[PDB]
Design a protein around this ligand. Structure first.
Ligand SMILES: COc1ccc2[nH]n(C[C@@]3(C)NC(=O)NC3=O)c(=O)c2c1
Ligand SMILES: [Zn+2]
Length: 255
């Protein structure tokens, strides 16, 4: 397979919710956007430099098309929910939403905009239970790159599963930027078709002395080991097949 430079970039709709704006953006558009621009660019370096077939099938990456900045909580009617509402759901007494329900709600609310982009990604600031940092569709044992309709019987409309989310809060504190970059890499990894690296394949889950785990390992990589910022051969095989199938459908030229 040969790369098409006219169809080698997955353009993103990046959404910063009110929690992200307040806690990460310090209530400023400049601070909020600079954080996301720099994070996406560092993630793009991991992707763009990856040779998916271990040869010349490289130069595939991600770029931001738009950053939506939600400065305040979404006003909701009684019984109505929205990913950007003030309260956490299902438990308002908790700092965070149930992560799966949040990804579902974001996908529902962002459906119209998501239909026009390769991927939509939510950046929030909430302490998900049991150390979870993000969630995404694709590479699950459907969804991922390029909007694919799913009729929601509950929602009564089509939603698109080209979505993921990252939280930069864990255990009551802001995560390191080196940690945040890896969360987003991991979530987009799922979007790109990669499943978790299994323990049973040494090639895909190396020991610490061997450079450590790759980004798709199910236990969040810290970023202090060499392999942490890279995709395993297992992830490359899965993503290679996805890119081959999906680039013509929704990838665009690098800006
Ligand atoms: C480096 O970031 C990572 C790496 C592994 C992770 N595992 N999890 C939990 C969960 C449900 N989310 C996800 O995308 N994969 C999963 O198993 C992170 O939230 C996570 C984040
Ligand atoms: Zn995962």
């Amino acid at each position: 397979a040969d790369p098409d430079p006219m169809k080698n970039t997955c353009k993103l709709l990046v959404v910063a919710d009110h929690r992200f704006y307040r806690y990460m953006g310090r209530g400023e558009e400049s601070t909020t956007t600079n954080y996301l621009i720099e994070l996406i660019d560092r993630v793009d370096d991991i992707y763009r430099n990856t040779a998916w077939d271990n040869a010349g099938f490289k130069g595939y990456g991600i770029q931001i098309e738009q950053i939506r900045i939600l400065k305040s909580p979404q006003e909701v009617k009684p019984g109505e929910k929205h990913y950007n509402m003030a309260k956490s759901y299902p438990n308002e007494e908790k700092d965070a939403w149930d992560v799966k329900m949040l990804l579902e709600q974001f996908s529902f609310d962002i459906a119209e905009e998501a239909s026009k982009v390769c991927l939509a990604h939510l950046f929030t600031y909430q302490d998900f239970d049991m150390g979870t940092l993000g969630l995404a569709y694709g590479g699950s044992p459907h969804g991922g790159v390029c909007p694919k309709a799913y009729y929601s019987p509950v929602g009564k409309k089509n939603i698109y599963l080209n979505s993921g989310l990252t939280s930069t809060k864990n255990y009551g504190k802001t995560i390191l930027t080196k940690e945040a970059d890896l969360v987003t890499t991991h979530e987009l990894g799922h979007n790109f078709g990669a499943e978790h690296d299994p323990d049973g394949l040494a090639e895909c889950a190396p020991n610490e002395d061997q450079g450590g785990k790759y980004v798709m390992y199910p236990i969040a990589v810290s970023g202090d080991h060499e392999n942490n910022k890279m995709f395993s051969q297992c992830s490359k095989q899965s993503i290679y097949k996805t890119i081959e199938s999906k680039a013509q459908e929704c990838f665009q030229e690098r800006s």
